[PDB]
């Protein structure tokens, strides 16, 4: 669209202060801030026109401060974050009352403790002989499990090249322990090729899961590896 | 204050069918916009008054009668998602979005072959794959707590001009068989159940 | 002291005061001449802004025609706060005052204006480099913008109570050597937007920099 937002993803421990940035389309004098919770539509937080803040919604916590610090760009500060702050924070820009152009958004997850943050474990499930003999097609199943938060990006790679044909990932990840508030997630995806293509031992198939974790500035005091932004992959080779 | 009402809240369309999405608003408007969300809001139309066309999509707003219509011609599986209507309303400014119209486009399955296959790990670990079932089939969640079942998705094998639906089930238990995997779902009587290995 | 309270401000006034005095870029230039314009009470500065995505021109409001006649076409210095919202009823920014005649108004060495601060009666030292001018005759606007910038960065003057802003009442006093006083109430904000908030600078009040000091009285009650 031309509207930029950073960070794209953010994990904070409850009670910590968080700041988001929006870089609008240069010519646009108007800048909007919206909050979007799961299943709901975007909710107006505040808006600027040039150097001036025009309106802030009546139902907007004293914990929120939106500023235009050095010209075009805007910052959104949320102090003492709580679980209810976990949302997609959207930014929009326009030339007055005309067409609003939206940014990619900031995915904010407010966790109880950063120890609840886990990267995914990725596995590839090889096509069944029964599927091959019944359809002359071969389906690969990717299983990304035990990740928190649900900040993931799944992609399939065939012989070092990303594929978009014969692919479908689940609409949203599923909670492993739906009873728990800081439950880990599981996500699956499928890649379907012909039996012929799978039977060729020269073919390589990789499921790549991009995970958005902790930043370099985050403190970690645990025996396990620091769950930073990383790629976790699983791979399979063809067989007759 | 300013109220926005979108209808239908949920819409089920067969691949290639046409549908009219409605947006009703309480006051006179300066800005009206139609959006499509995938989490990136795609700008479909800016239409406070008149009629506009954008390929398979068309929209019309009667400012006086306080309503806006969104026409989707020859629906595709990529058209699936949430459609939003948003207004500004000509006292105190607030840009109000509607609840949205969640659209689910059912893929046209030429020759359905519903089957449940067991897939083993590339490196004792297994997965139950329900595939080739018709788009109208609803995949339900399990009665069991240790059994995980995914929602359905359509893949498109563009080279073969073939479309197929699939859902995945797995458990940490050894008592997990693919024949009992989708028992909570109402599946076709002719669903193929091959034996493992 | 019958000073206005922070709590009495309009819905968006506090945030807009924060923008003007701490965030917003200022119109700071020397050796400028206003262009031909039939508009009364205003000076047009065509092409004032170089490489700005919103503005090209700067519109300066002085209030009267007697003030406009004194500065029209003349060689001038500019120092003030500009705004685009509600300006000229395009690609033009607005300003109230901040106009001084260019010729013979410069100093050889920059005058550092001393600041005397009082928080609930308690005296506190202010770094000397906070309020400084290169002019012999300075607008009150030039001094006030620099003084209120320090106050917000140090005390959070225009920050909400939840964001650490403890000052509820304030008074800025510009004390001239001859015993003259120019005093603005820090919370007596007119309206909520810069078009009304910056209207205090329209009179274009100019004072002498030689042996001039600033007196500040801040209260958390
Ligand atoms: Zn004094």
Residue numbers in the entry:
A (entry chain B): 3 to 242
B (entry chain A): 2 to 39, 42 to 93, 96 to 128, 131 to 204
C (entry chain C): 10 to 98, 102 to 233
Question: What does the published report state?
Answer:
Superantigens (SAgs) are immune stimulatory toxins secreted by bacteria, such as Staphylococcus aureus, which are capable of evoking an immune response of large proportions. This ability stems from their capacity to cross-link the major histocompatibility complex (MHC) class II on the antigen-presenting cell with the T cell receptor (TCR) and activate large fractions of the T cell population. In this work, we present the X-ray structures of SEA in complex with a human TCR, as well as SEE complexed with the same TCR. In both the SEA and the SEE structures, the SAgs utilize a shallow groove between the N- and C-terminal domains to engage with the TRBV domain of TCR.
